[PDB]
Amino acid sequence: QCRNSIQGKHLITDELGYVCERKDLLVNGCCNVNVPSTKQYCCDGCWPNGCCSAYEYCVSCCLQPHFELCLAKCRTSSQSVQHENTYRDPIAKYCYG
Amino acid sequence: PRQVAQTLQADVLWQMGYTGANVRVAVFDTGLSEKHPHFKNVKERTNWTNERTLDDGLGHGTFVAGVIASMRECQGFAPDAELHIFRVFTNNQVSYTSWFLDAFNYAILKKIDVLNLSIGGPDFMDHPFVDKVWELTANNVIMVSAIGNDGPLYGTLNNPADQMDVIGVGGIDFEDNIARFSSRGMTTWELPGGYGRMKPDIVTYGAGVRGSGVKGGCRALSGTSVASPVVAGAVTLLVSTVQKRELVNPASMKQALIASARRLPGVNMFEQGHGKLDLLRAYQILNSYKPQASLSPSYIDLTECPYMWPYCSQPIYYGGMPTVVNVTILNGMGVTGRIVDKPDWQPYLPQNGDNIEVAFSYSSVLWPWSGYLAISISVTKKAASWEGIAQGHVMITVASPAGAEQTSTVKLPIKVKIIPTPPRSKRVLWDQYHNLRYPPGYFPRDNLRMKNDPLDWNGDHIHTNFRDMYQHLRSMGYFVEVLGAPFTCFDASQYGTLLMVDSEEEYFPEEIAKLRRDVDNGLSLVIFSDWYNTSVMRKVKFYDENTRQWWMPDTGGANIPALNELLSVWNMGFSDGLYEGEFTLANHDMYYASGCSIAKFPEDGVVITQTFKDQGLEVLKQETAVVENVPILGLYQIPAEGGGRIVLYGDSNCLDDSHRQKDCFWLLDALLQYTSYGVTPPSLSHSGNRQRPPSGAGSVTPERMEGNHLHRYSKVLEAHLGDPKPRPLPACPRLSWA
Numbered sequence A: 001q002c003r004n005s006i007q008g009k010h011l012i013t014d015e016l017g018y019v020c021e022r023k024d025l026l027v028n029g030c031c032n033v034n035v036p037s038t039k040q041y042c043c044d045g046c047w048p049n050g051c052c053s054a055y056e057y058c059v060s061c062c063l064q065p066h067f068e069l070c071l072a073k074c075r076t077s078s079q080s081v082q083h084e085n086t087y088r089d090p091i092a093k094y095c096y097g
Numbered sequence B: 001p002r003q004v005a006q007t008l009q010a011d012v013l014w015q016m017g018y019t020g021a022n023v024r025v026a027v028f029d030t031g032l033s034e035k036h037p038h039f040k041n042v043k044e045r046t047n048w049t050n051e052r053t054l055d056d057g058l059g060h061g062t063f064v065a066g067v068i069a070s071m072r073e074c075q076g077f078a079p080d081a082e083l084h085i086f087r088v089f090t091n092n093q094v095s096y097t098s099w100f101l102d103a104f105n106y107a108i109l110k111k112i113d114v115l116n117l118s119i120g121g122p123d124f125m126d127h128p129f130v131d132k133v134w135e136l137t138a139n140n141v142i143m144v145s146a147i148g149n150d151g152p153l154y155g156t157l158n159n160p161a162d163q164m165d166v167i168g169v170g171g172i173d174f175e176d177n178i179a180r181f182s183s184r185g186m187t188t189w190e191l192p193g194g195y196g197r198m199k200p201d202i203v204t205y206g207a208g209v210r211g212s213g214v215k216g217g218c219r220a221l222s223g224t225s226v227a228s229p230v231v232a233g234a235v236t237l238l239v240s241t242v243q244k245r246e247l248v249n250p251a252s253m254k255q256a257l258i259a260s261a262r263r264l265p266g267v268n269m270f271e272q273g274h275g276k277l278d279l280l281r282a283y284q285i286l287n288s289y290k291p292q293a294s295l296s297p298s299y300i301d302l303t304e305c306p307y308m309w310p311y312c313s314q315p316i317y318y319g320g321m322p323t324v325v326n327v328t329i330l331n332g333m334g335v336t337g338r339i340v341d342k343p344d345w346q347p348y349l350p351q352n353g354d355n356i357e358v359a360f361s362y363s364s365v366l367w368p369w370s371g372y373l374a375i376s377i378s379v380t381k382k383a384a385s386w387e388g389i390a391q392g393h394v395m396i397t398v399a400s401p402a403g404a405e406q407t408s409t410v411k412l413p414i415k416v417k418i419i420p421t422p423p424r425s426k427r428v429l430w431d432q433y434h435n436l437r438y439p440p441g442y443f444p445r446d447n448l449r450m451k452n453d454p455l456d457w458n459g460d461h462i463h464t465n466f467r468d469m470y471q472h473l474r475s476m477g478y479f480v481e482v483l484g485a486p487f488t489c490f491d492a493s494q495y496g497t498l499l500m501v502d503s504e505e506e507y508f509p510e511e512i513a514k515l516r517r518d519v520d521n522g523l524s525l526v527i528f529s530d531w532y533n534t535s536v537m538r539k540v541k542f543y544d545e546n547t548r549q550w551w552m553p554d555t556g557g558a559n560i561p562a563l564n565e566l567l568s569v570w571n572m573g574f575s576d577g578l579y580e581g582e583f584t585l586a587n588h589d590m591y592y593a594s595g596c597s598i599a600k601f602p603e604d605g606v607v608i609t610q611t612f613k614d615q616g617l618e619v620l621k622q623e624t625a626v627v628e629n630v631p632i633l634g635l636y637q638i639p640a641e642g643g644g645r646i647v648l649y650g651d652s653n654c655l656d657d658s659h660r661q662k663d664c665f666w667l668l669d670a671l672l673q674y675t676s677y678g679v680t681p682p683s684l685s686h687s688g689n690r691q692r693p694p695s696g697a698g699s700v701t702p703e704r705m706e707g708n709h710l711h712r713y714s715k716v717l718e719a720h721l722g723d724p725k726p727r728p729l730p731a732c733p734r735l736s737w738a
C-alpha cells in the first residue's frame, strides 16, 4: 500500500515520489509507473527559489533524494501570503523551501 | 429547559451505544477553558491568535463545544466525540487568514473527521483560504460551516459555508422557522457570467439553543454560529453510528443529511437547502447507503415551489437567456470523479419533453469529493409559442477510480415550465456584467452613514440584495433576465430596457458603440448611479484589519467617471458632490442615502430636483450645509426615431436591500414603465420639482482618483498600472446544446 497525496485534483504523489494523473492511480494507492507520464521526483514547474505551481509537484520535488512533512510544507501557509489574503507568488504558491 | 440533543432524538441513538465515539471533531472558535466540567474528551486546545491564552474570554468557543459534545446539564449530540479546540479568533472575534491557514494545516495533520467553523467571512476571493478549505475537504474532513448571521438579506453567504465541499448550515428556531439572522441566497462566485449554487445545505436549530457556559451552567445563544455546531454534533453522532467507516466521506455524509432532511414547508431551497436535519432518518439512510453519485437539487422542477424559488418565479420562453441550474454533484465513490460522457439528455416525447434543449457544462474532474454540473436549459424555436410542462431526464454517469470504474448513473429529472416569448417590454435585462464588488477590491458602501457595513459585497444580483426588488418586478409582470456579458453579447431587440444599477465597471469602446446602436434601435437604459467624490473617497479610506492595510476606494459609490464616459455620447454626465437626506416624490417618501448629482444633462430632459444635505462637507470638515436644487434624477428620450430612453439616478440604496431606510420600488417600477412603454411618468413630469436641466458648464468634471486601482479588478481595463486601457472586446459565450 502507498500513502498518496489525497488532495490532488489532477495529480497524485505517493510516498515513493511518483506523480501520476488521477486516471493512473492504482488500488493500493500507488501511481502507475508503467505509464510514461508517471515520473518520480519531478520538479516540473518548480522555480529556483523553491516554489512550484502544483502542490503534488511541490511534494515530489520535496521528496527528492518525510512524506507528511512534504505534504505539510507544500500547503499554502502563513508565510505564503502577504496582507493575509494574497499570495506573494500566485503562480508558485506551493513552496518547499 | 430545552435540550437540543434530546429534541433531535440523539437519545434514541445513545441507547444503541453510538455516542460519537472514535470521531474527531475540531472547533474553530474563540477557545475553551482548561478544565471545563461539561466535557470528558477534550484532547487538545491550540491558540493561533497573537493573544497569549488558550482560554475563552467571550464564551463562544465554549458554547460551540458544549452544543457539539456537552454531557452535563445541557447535553451535546456526541458526548464521546473527541473534541479539538482551535483558538483562531481573539476575544473580539478577530482572525487573520494566515492563522486560518496554519490552523487548517494542523487540522489536516490531526485527521479530524468533522470540523465546525461557526464564524466565516464574506471574502470568498481569499484564494489561500479557499484553496486551504478545498485541501481540507479533499483530505476526508467533513466541514460543517455556518452560512453567516447576516440574514434575512440574500447574498449574505459566508465563506467557506458556500463551497460545494462544505456543509452549509443555516438556522431555524425551535419552531422550525428559518431564523432571521440566517444567511440566504445563492452563491455569488459565478457572477456575472454564471449562476450560483444552492445553499445552505441544511438548516438546524440556531436560536435559543442552550450550551455550555464559560465556567459552567448553560446559556442560550443565537446565530448560524449556533446552528452549525448542532449539525456538526449530529454529523459526529452519525459518523459514530455507521458500521463501515470507509463509506463515510464528505460526499456520503452530505448525501445522507440531504436525503434524510425534512423539507420545511413554505421555505425555498436557497433558505433551507434540502430541509431540517433529521437524525434518525439520516441514521437509516446511512445504514442503507452505498457509494453513489447524487445531485443537489436532485431534480430540476422549475414548477414545484416555493422550494424551487427563484426557478419557479418565472417560466422559460424562447429568446430568453439560458436558464442555468448549477447542480452540485455529490460523488460518494471517490474524492476525484469524472463525467463519463456528455450527459445524456433524454427527453419525454409522450409529454412534449423535446421542447427543451439542455446544454451541459461541468468539471473536467469532480474534486474534491464533489463538483458542479451547470445545466443550461433553453426552449427551442418550435416551442416559441408552446405553453406547457417540458419533461425529461438527464442521465449523468459519474465514474470514479476503483479496476473497473465505479459507474454511478444518476437520473436528474428536468420538469420545466414553458411559455411563448413575452413582448419586448416585459423582458428586463439586469446588468450584472458591469458590477464590481468586494471580495476582490474595496468598493465602498453606497450609503456613507452605514459605518457598520463599509463594503458593497452582497453580489448586487436580482437574487442577492436585490431579491426584494426582483420579487417586486416578478409580481409586476416583468421577466428579469441577467446580462452576464458585455453589451455586445445580447440581442437588444429582445429587451425593452437595460437596468444598470450601482455600476462600478468601466466600458469597452465597442461596448459603448454597441449600446449606442441599441439605444437608437430601441433599447432603453435605467442607470441607478451612486455617489462619487475624490475627496470623500479619500476621507472614507479605512483600515482593513484582515489585511492590516489602509484601503482607499477603487471607485466611489459608482464609477462616475466611467458612467460619464458612457454617457458623453448622449451629452449627459454626473457630478461629484455628495448629497443626502429624506425627501418625497409624487406623495411617496424617499431617502437619498449617498449619491451624486447630474452635472450635465441635455436641455430636453424631464428633470426633477430637490434640496438635500451636502454630505461631502460633513465627511471632510464635519460641517453642515443644505444644498438648493440638487438634480438627482433625469429623464431623456433619444431624438432619433425608434430611439431608446435614458434615466439617470444618483443613488442605488433605494433598491438595494442591505440597510434600507425607505423604498423606491415604486420609482423603479415607474422608471421601467418609462423605459419600456414610452408613456411619461406623471410622478416626475408633472412634479413641482422640475427645473431647467443642467449644462455642466463651469462645473469641473469628476475625474478618476489619482493612483486608483480599479483596473486591478476590472473585466474591461487591463492591469497595466500606467494609463490603463480597455482590453480587446471578449468573444461572446456560446453553448452546444445536448
Ligand SMILES: *[C@@H]1O[C@H](CO)[C@@H](O[C@@H]2O[C@H](CO)[C@@H](O[C@@H]3O[C@H](CO)[C@@H](O)[C@H](O)[C@@H]3O)[C@H](O)[C@H]2NC(C)=O)[C@H](O)[C@H]1NC(C)=O
Binding pocket: B164, B189, B190, B193, B194, B195, B196, B197, B324, B326, B327, B361, B363, B372, B373, B374, B375
Ligand atoms: C457552478 O459552480 C461552480 C463552482 O462555483 C463554478 O465553477 C467554476 O467555473 C469556472 C468557469 O468559468 C471555472 O473557471 C476556471 O478558470 C480557469 C482559468 O484558467 C481554468 O483553468 C479552470 O479549469 C476553470 O475553468 C472555475 O474554476 C470553477 N470553480 C470551481 C470551484 O470548480 C461553475 O462556473 C458554475 N457553473 C456555471 C456558472 O454555469
Ligand SMILES: [Ca+2]
Binding pocket: B435, B436, B437, B456, B460, B501, B502, B503, B504
Ligand atoms: Ca454594484
